[PDB]
Design a protein around this nucleic acid. Structure first.
Ligand SMILES: [Mg+2]
Lengths: 308, 53, 232, 62, 16, 74, 92, 181, 149, 71, 54, 41
RNA sequence: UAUACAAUUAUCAUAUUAAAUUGUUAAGUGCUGAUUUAACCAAUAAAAAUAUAAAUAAUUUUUAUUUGUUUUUAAACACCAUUAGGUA
RNA sequence: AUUAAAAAGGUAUUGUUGCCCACCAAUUUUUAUAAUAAAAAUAACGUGCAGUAAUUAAUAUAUUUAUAAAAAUAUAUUUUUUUUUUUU
């Protein structure tokens, strides 16, 4: 693991005199820590052991340099170095150790380490439980980061092309709309800066007229249509082609059309409840009339078929 | 000893809290005299916690 | 037995001898259910009576004739006061509120083994190391933290007349001025009333106890009200 | 049944006399079930089982 | 399964 | 089982002082005299003018060994 | 503190092994247990044994000649002690 | 078989003792006590002092108890905790006796002070044996010789209790006929 | 000190001992490690019996102390090699030198200093205090002057 | 800690701490600092049931000095 | 330390080769000089008897 | 254990009456339950 | 037949924030033979020893999963046999 | 001239000539109609003596044996009555 060089570039840009001093004193022992601004925290110097900066090991022997090099770090030290390297690339500032991004990357690395350890030796039920708890915490951190920003998501989730993490736990809970209820409960229910992501003028409805958001969009000439898969596009095309097909079919081949019209005309006579009374008008006949569903009628077997 | 039940209950509480709060007053399984030296590969030699199994 | 008849006030079940003490600072009022500190019934209670009661440095209930928690300073500031007045008994240089004490059930646990004299799970974080290794390894040619001045916060409170600044006025051992209710809308006149005695205190330290016209009128009203009180 | 029927704040899990009446029921149930299990297992050694076996025997044709 | 003194009443046996 | 011989006659260690507390006697004698059909005793007639101190709670209720309840016994 | 380099490894090893050569004009350094082990000559042969272990050494395996090693007496530290010891030797 | 097992070191036609003996032996690294017996110190007294040490330290008790029979870990923990609690209670009981004996010593010292007051300091010293009649050095030398011989402290070890072999050996560390649970 | 092994080996010939030490050193340096120091004691007399080639108890052995700094991955392999080497009668591993039980948690205090000062030897006496005083004073006098050359 | 357990409130724990301190004969009680708890303490002080109260501007807790009469 | 020493061979599995030499470091309860905080009561009753006999 | 729980003392009658500020009878008197049947004749 | 538990502590199956897991050592005669046990007794009989510093308390345990049967050298060893052995 | 002088228990109240245990034996009830199974009441019989500090302690789970209480093992407990070591 190595530090990104954006830190060196930023330090040289911010402090020209100190950077030039370091460059001119390269290879010479230094009694004053010019790199204090370069290394605000202990975790920000993970190249060498014990948070020793590279510039400090200048007037010392190559034996000491090798002993403090990366090749002499323990497993825990290597894990912490990798964690710090990943965290500093997502932290909003040097001291950012509470943001959901840094929390998520730290928890993800810890989960990876725990999974590797469990693959080696799986007889640690304590490790299994702590891995489950860390996975839960990582899921919560990512759910919280979702609402604050998603550019970080399209930056981080491309790691190994996961694109499927934060999967809903179960269909029974997901159907009742409790998977998205976490955003409501976390206080990030509605915080997206809607105006920047899309035009908010056509995303609402007129109270005075009562027309829906779609009606407002069509009146304003806008179209808020989500990306569509193949099946819905096929359905739309098939339904659109209906009038064009029928207009030519009726003219070209009126025989079959007239036969079907005769059949429908006689079917309307020979049916059930030709009068449009309340019984026939009942949109959900089995649900409305249940007391006669067992002994009077046999057509329906279940009293309800939909959510209502 | 049975007039000092509270002290041993505290000991058991400490052990239970240590082992993820699952096993209360449970001890690790007995192992053979040379269990760490005569058991073949793939078998646990050092006894584990009653929760770890 | 009394436990068989009355069970709402007494619990004879083992592992529940801790009680239902609400006077602790723990996250739950059930001491036997809390999992922060575990009672060592065999050795605790040396200076706090029973083993289940909170320690002297972790108590939130105070008697009438018992000293309160000393202030940690970490005399110099008593020059203006009586020269022969020694160090204030309520000022301690080493006082840790959350100072963990060694407990056998939590720290030196031996139930897993046969409880032999030679074994037992022990953690060394509870008590500071007495080994001479400490100072020798932590011996440096350069001076210590107080000389190097690496602390910028200082005291948590901005200005303490007892610690940070010189101390003026008169000492108040019993909490009398610190436990009182203001009788004036501007909180300049304060009053503490017992069953028969009423004490009225002027609190204007910003102006060296100087009274304005409105303050003097309010003070006169309070004086002639407290003097003309029935039980005064 | 309810083995731990001791009164409120009983310093013991149960009562020795009360536990015997439950142990007797458990022992009797286990004994009768074990005896019936052994009998129905020994049913397989009757010659009727041999007749069933020879009836279930298949034909091996070369 | 119910112990019952036949010679003397149970309450009379119990009220020691 | 083993039980101490005098466990049955063991005094209650938490409420054996409330009976002998001076304030209980003071209040009961005050009510009894105020009923109007009881000749006041000399101790009541004297201690009505000099009631005992208020803050002398016993260690049984204080459960704090470092409390100096009695100024005389301090 | 100087680590042993790869190039000087054999020289360091030879010096470490020759730290006990059964013959010197200066006292031998103690080991990590503060003891005086057997003084060995070249090519790995025990030739001197301290008097404390002398009886055990001669009992475990006989006909194994080994002069009982005696620590070098201190004379440069204090000259008067050397004269006293020589006078004691003369007086027997 | 372990070296402490009941059928260990058995003498039989088919049984051959394991390990090498003599010089560097099987017990060469496992000998707990080694003493160089010297003239004027009998080996019987050496063995007596060693046995008294290992008995008063409650170590032979544990050795026999763990060696002869097998006892469950629960039983061993129960016995050890009972022993610890009984020892603590006995220490608490004996502290009061020590305090009262110190008080009685104070009373004896007060009576000695009363005797000093009623007889004179010099008279009390003479009664205590002050060398006020030691005209020559030999007179005080005789008492110096007496106290020098009295200072000689012989070994204070006492005879160890015997071991009782009860039938079926319910308890193996039993050293007295008193019955125990 | 990162790691410190203590080995007991047969009192072989000088050539054989040198060959074994060369093999151990080559094995250590192959994994890109650094030996902090290696000290050799004499032919000691261990209490426990260690069996020789002829399955007989040999009560004489030679002690070697090997202080070094290597990563865990390479340390496992090197320790396995040293333990499986025939000449090494027995090897003991010391791993808690970085964080001894006597120790906000400054790690560089014990890593720089050798194991000898971490674990005082029996022959040490009171004069080591005066020796420490003299060494500390000279080092604090000369360290920056020698560093800024 | 669990669903079955009652959902405790600052008013509830303040009341129980005050009651326990009263039963144990204490002088000062440290009680949680909320607007409702401070109002309750002020009303009790006004009615004389409590010797006094002080809201030290600490986010967690404030102090209440109790009163006793005739033992 | 005992485990490490036994494993390496520096310490015997049973007994101590410095029990006699460690007696000076071990505290000695002199019979002549009384200690007020003695664990045993005989060391106090002997001094009581001595004073009474005087 | 088989027995139910019993209070140490009574519940204050004033508190018991005060906790009944939203009982079903009070709700009916306030008119919260909407009427859809015929009710009394 | 209708007509007011508790919530300050309740022993039989309601576990849910917890640091675990893994170390490679010990013991090796055959000799003229009565060991163990209340008693009988069976066949080489001696043996396996290393720790701490370090893992956040939380707002979706609603979520993986988990509580002394866990398979081989010795020592232990329950059915059954009776001159007396097998068997975790 | 070697001696009396400690602790330590009712499941019994008809109070050991006691409660109590299954089996055996006898009457009968309830669920059930399936050649079922299960559960409950009962003063005298027969085999015993399992439990009740109760004659090799008792409790819990697992295995096993069977005229019956139960018994023996593996593991975990004591509603088992208890006996003094603060660096020899
Ligand atoms: Mg019986």
């Amino acid at each position: 693991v190595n530090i990104p060089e954006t830190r060196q570039m930023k330090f040289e840009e911010q402090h020209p005199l100190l950077a030039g001093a370091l460059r001119k004193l390269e290879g010479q022992p230094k009694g004053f820590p010019f790199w204090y601004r370069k290394y605000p925290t202990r975790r920000h110097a993970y190249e060498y052991r014990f948070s020793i900066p590279v510039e400090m090991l200048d007037g010392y022997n190559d034996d000491v340099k090798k002993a403090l090099s990366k090749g002499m770090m323990s497993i825990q030290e290597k894990q912490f170095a990798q964690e710090a390297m990943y965290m500093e690339r997502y932290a909003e500032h040097d001291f950012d150790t509470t943001s959901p991004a840094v929390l998520a990357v730290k928890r993800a690395l810890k989960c990876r380490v725990l999974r590797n350890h469990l693959l080696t030796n799986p007889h640690n039920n304590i490790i299994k439980t702590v891995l489950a708890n860390t996975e839960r915490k990582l899921n919560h951190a990512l759910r919280r980061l979702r609402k604050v920003d998603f550019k970080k998501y399209w930056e981080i989730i491309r790691d190994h092309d996961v694109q499927d993490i934060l999967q809903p736990p179960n269909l029974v809970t997901y159907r009742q709309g409790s998977y998205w209820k976490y955003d409501w409960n976390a206080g990030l229910a509605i915080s997206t800066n809607l105006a920047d992501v899309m035009d908010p003028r056509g995303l609402n409805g007129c109270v005075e007229t009562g027309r829906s958001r779609s009606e407002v969009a069509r009146d304003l000439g806008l179209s808020y249509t989500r990306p569509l898969h193949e099946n819905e596009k096929k359905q739309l095309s098939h339904q659109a082609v209906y009038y064009e097909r029928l207009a030519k079919f009726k003219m070209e081949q009126p025989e079959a059309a007239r036969a079907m019209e005769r059949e429908r005309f006689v079917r309307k006579f020979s049916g059930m409840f030709v009068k449009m009374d309340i019984r026939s008008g009942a949109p959900d006949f089995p649900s409305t009339y249940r007391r006669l569903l067992g002994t009077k009628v046999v057509r329906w077997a279940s009293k309800r078929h939909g959510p209502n | 000893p049975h007039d000092w039940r509270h002290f041993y209950a505290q000991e058991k509480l400490v052990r239970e809290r240590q082992q993820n709060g699952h096993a209360y007053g449970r001890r690790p399984k007995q192992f053979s005299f040379g269990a760490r030296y005569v058991k073949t590969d793939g078998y646990g030699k050092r006894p584990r916690l009653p929760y770890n199994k | 037995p009394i436990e068989f008849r009355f069970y709402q006030r007494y619990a004879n079940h083992p592992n529940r001898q801790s009680g239902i003490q609400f006077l602790t600072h723990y996250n739950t009022h059930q001491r036997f259910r809390v999992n922060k500190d575990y009672i060592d019934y065999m050795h605790w209670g040396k200076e706090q009576g029973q083993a289940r009661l909170p320690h002297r440095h972790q108590r939130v209930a105070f008697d009438f004739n018992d000293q309160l928690h000393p202030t940690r300073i970490g005399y110099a500031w008593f020059a203006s006061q009586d020269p022969t007045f020694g160090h204030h008994p309520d000022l301690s240089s080493s006082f840790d509120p959350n100072y963990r004490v060694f407990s056998h059930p939590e720290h030196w646990n031996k139930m897993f083994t046969k409880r032999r004299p030679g074994e037992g799970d022990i953690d060394l974080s509870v008590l500071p190391s007495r080994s001479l290794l400490g100072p020798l390894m932590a011996h440096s040619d350069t001076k210590g933290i107080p000389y190097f001045k690496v602390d910028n916060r200082g005291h948590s409170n901005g200005r303490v007349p007892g610690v940070n600044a010189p101390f003026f006025g008169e000492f108040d051992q019993k909490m009398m001025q610190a436990m009182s209710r203001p009788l004036n809308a501007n909180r300049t006149i304060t009053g503490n009333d017992g069953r028969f005695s009423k004490t009225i205190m002027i609190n204007e330290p910003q102006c060296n106890q100087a009274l304005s016209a409105k303050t003097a009128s309010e003070l006169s009203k309070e004086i002639d009200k407290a003097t003309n009180a029935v039980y005064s | 049944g309810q083995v731990t029927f001791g009164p409120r704040n009983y310093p013991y899990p149960s009562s020795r006399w009360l536990a015997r009446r439950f142990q007797m029921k458990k022992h009797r149930i286990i004994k009768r079930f074990r005896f019936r299990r052994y009998k129905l297992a020994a049913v397989a050694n009757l010659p009727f089982a041999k007749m069933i076996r020879v009836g279930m025997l298949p034909e091996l044709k070369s | 399964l119910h112990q019952y003194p036949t010679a003397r009443h149970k309450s009379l046996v119990k009220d020691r | 089982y083993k039980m101490p011989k005098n466990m049955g006659v063991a005094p209650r260690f938490d409420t054996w002082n409330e009976k002998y507390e001076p304030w209980e006697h003071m209040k009961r004698m005050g009510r009894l005299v105020g009923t109007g059909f009881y000749i006041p005793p000399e101790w009541y007639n004297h201690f009505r003018m000099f009631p005992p101190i208020n803050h002398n709670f016993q260690q049984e209720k204080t459960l704090n060994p470092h409390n100096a309840s009695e100024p005389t016994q301090d | 503190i100087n680590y042993v380099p790869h190039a000087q490894l054999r020289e360091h090893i030879d010096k470490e092994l020759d730290k006990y050569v059964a013959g010197k004009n200066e006292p031998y350094p103690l080991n990590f247990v503060g003891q005086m082990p057997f003084l060995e000559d070249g090519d790995g042969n025990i030739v001197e044994v301290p008097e404390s272990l002398l009886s055990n050494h001669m009992a475990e395996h006989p006909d194994s000649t080994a002069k009982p090693h005696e620590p070098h007496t201190s004379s440069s530290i204090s000259e008067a002690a050397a004269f006293e010891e020589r006078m004691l030797r003369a007086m027997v | 078989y372990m070296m402490y097992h009941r059928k260990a070191m058995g003498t039989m036609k088919y049984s051959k003792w394991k390990g090498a003996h003599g010089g560097i032996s099987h017990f060469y690294g496992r000998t707990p006590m080694v003493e160089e017996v010297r003239p004027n110190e009998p080996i019987t007294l050496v063995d007596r002092r060693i046995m008294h040490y290992v008995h008063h330290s409650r170590l032979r008790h544990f050795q026999l108890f763990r060696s002869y029979q097998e006892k469950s870990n629960s039983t061993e923990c129960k016995l050890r905790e009972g022993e610890m609690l009984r020892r603590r209670w006995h220490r608490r009981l004996q502290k009061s006796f020590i305090a009262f004996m110190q008080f009685k010593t104070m009373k004896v010292l007060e009576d000695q002070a009363r005797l000093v007051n009623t007889y004179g300091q010099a008279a009390v010293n003479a009664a205590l044996g002050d060398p006020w009649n030691a005209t020559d050095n030999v007179a005080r030398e005789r008492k110096s010789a007496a106290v020098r011989r009295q200072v000689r402290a012989l070994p204070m070890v006492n005879v160890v209790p015997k071991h009782v072999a009860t039938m079926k050996q319910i308890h193996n560390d039993r050293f007295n006929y008193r019955w125990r649970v | 000190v990162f790691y410190s092994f203590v080995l007991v080996m047969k009192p072989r010939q000088r050539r054989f001992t040198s060959q074994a030490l060369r093999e151990i050193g080559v094995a250590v340096y192959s994994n890109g490690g650094l030996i902090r120091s290696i000290t050799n004691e004499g032919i000691m007399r261990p209490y426990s019996r260690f069996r020789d080639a002829d399955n007989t108890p040999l009560t004489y052995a030679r002690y070697i102390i090997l202080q070094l700094d290597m990563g865990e991955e390479e340390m496992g392999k090197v320790d396995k090699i040293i333990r499986e080497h025939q000449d090494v009668l027995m090897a003991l591993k010391l791993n808690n030198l970085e964080r001894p039980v006597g120790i906000a948690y400054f790690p560089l205090d014990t890593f720089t200093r050798l194991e000898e000062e971490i674990n005082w030897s029996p022959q040490t006496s009171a004069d080591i205090y005066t020796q420490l005083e003299m060494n500390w004073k000279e080092f604090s006098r000369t360290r920056w002057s020698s560093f800024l050359r | 800690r669990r669903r079955e357990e009652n959902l405790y409130t600052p008013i509830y724990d303040f009341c129980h701490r005050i009651r326990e301190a009263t039963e144990q004969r204490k002088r000062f009680v440290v009680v949680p600092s909320t607007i409702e708890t401070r109002g309750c303490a002020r009303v009790m002080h006004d009615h004389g049931l409590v010797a006094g109260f002080r809201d030290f501007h600490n986010d967690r807790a404030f102090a209440v000095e109790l009163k006793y009469f005739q033992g | 330390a005992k485990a490490q020493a036994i494993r390496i061979g520096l310490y015997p599995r049973f007994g101590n080769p410095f029990w006699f030499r460690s007696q000076k470091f071990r505290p000695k309860a002199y019979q002549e000089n009384y200690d007020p905080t003695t664990y045993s009561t005989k060391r106090t009753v002997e001094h009581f008897a001595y004073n009474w006999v005087q | 254990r088989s027995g139910k729980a019993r209070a140490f003392v009574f519940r204050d009658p004033s508190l018991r009456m005060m906790r009944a500020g939203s009982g079903y009878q009070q709700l009916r008197r306030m008119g919260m339950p909407m009427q859809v049947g015929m009710g009394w004749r």
